[PDB]
Amino acid sequence: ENERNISRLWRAFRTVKEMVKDRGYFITQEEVELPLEDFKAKYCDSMGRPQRKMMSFQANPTEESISKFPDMGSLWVEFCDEPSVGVKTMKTFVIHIQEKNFQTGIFVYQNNITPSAMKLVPSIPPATIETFNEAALVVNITHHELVPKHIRLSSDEKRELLKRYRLKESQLPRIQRADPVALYLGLKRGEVVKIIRKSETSGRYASYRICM
């Protein structure tokens, strides 16, 4: 029971690190391929409690990410210890996001979150706050065979593509803002995405969707 819960928490942590790396922040192969023995040596008590308070971390952009996106900011995460979501437990996080001046904020809860946060999360521009669930990140979705390689496409490339095909942002195929892929990519609406489909009759061919 406890070992299963720890394994699930671990897998969620691995998915979070992989999603940050895919988004484009400096992440190594360590803290992603963290073994069970190391996890139980580090993130465990005298009996093996999750102690998720120290699981939080920051994400800074890579040099390549800065070159591609000059406006890419910092990221913050926090894992709630309590089973539910506390109103003040989210107020402290939301004030800390602006206190440390983080451009993006990622939040993870255990089971459910009070509807008031839904009304309150999009309140501090230009900072963006997103929320995820521990049991919804047990396994990554980008590793699935049907899911192609989604890669965010830069503003310069977006202008180049629109000029090449003589298009508008509205005329592209549209991808919703609630898919597990767009949430995984942290794709702000208005940004064109790039998809590498493994077509059966053409091998590799690229298609572009826009989140809107």
Partner 1 sequence: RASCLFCHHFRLKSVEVHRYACKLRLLQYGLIDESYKLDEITL
Partner 2 sequence: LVTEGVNFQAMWDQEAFIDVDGITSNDVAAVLKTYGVEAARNTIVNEINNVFSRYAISVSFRHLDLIADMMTRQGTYLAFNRQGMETSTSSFMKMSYETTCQFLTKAVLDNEREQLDSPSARIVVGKLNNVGTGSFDVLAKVPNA
Partner 3 sequence: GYVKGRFYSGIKPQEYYFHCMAGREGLIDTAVKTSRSGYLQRCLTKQLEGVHVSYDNSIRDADGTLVQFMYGGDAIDITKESHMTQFEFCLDNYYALLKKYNPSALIEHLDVESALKYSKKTLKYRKKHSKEPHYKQSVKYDPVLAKYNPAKYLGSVSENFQDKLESFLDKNSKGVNEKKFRALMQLKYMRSLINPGEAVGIIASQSVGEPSTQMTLNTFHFAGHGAANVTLGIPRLREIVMTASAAIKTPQMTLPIWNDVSDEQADTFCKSISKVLLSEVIDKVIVT
Cα-based angle 25, 26, 27 (whole degrees, multiple of 5): 105
Select the binding partner of residue 73 from partner 2, partner 3, DNA, none (C-beta < 5 to 8 A, by kind). none
Residue in 40, 58, 176, 206 binding partner 2, rule: CB under 8 A: 176
**149 is a contact residue toward partner 3 (CB under 8 A):** yes
SS3 content of the chain, % helix, strand, coil (to 5): 35, 20, 40
Instruction: Take residue 169 and report the two structure tokens written for it.
Output: 């942002």
Phi, psi (deg, nearest 5) at residue 92: -60, -45
Instruction: Take residue 8 and report the two structure tokens written for it.
Output: 């699930």
Per-residue interface string for the shown chain with partner 2, residues 109-148, x marking contact by CB under 8 A: --------------------------xx-xx-x-xxxxxx
Select the binding partner of residue 115 from partner 3, partner 2, DNA, none (C-beta < 5 to 8 A, by kind). DNA
Instruction: Take residue 205 and report the two structure tokens written for it.
Output: 């061919």
User: Which residues, numbered 24-63, are part of the site for partner 1 (CB under 8 A)?
Assistant: none
Chain-centre distance for alpha carbon 150: 13
Rounded Cα distance between 55 and 77, Å, is 9
Give min distance, CB of 117 to DNA, in A. 11
Interface with DNA by CB under 7 A: which residues?
A: 114-116
Give min distance, CB of 190 to partner 2, in A. 14
Other residues' Cβ atoms within 10 Å of the Cβ of residue 171: 11
Rounded Cα distance between 117 and 87, Å, is 8
Task: Count the site residues for partner 2 by CB under 8 A.
Answer: 28
Select the binding partner of residue 125 from partner 3, partner 2, partner 1, none (C-beta < 5 to 8 A, by kind). partner 1
Rounded Cα distance between 17 and 11, Å, is 10
From the list 5-13, 44-52, 109-117, 139-147, the region that binds partner 3 by CB under 8 A is 139-147
Give min distance, CB of 142 to partner 3, in A. 5
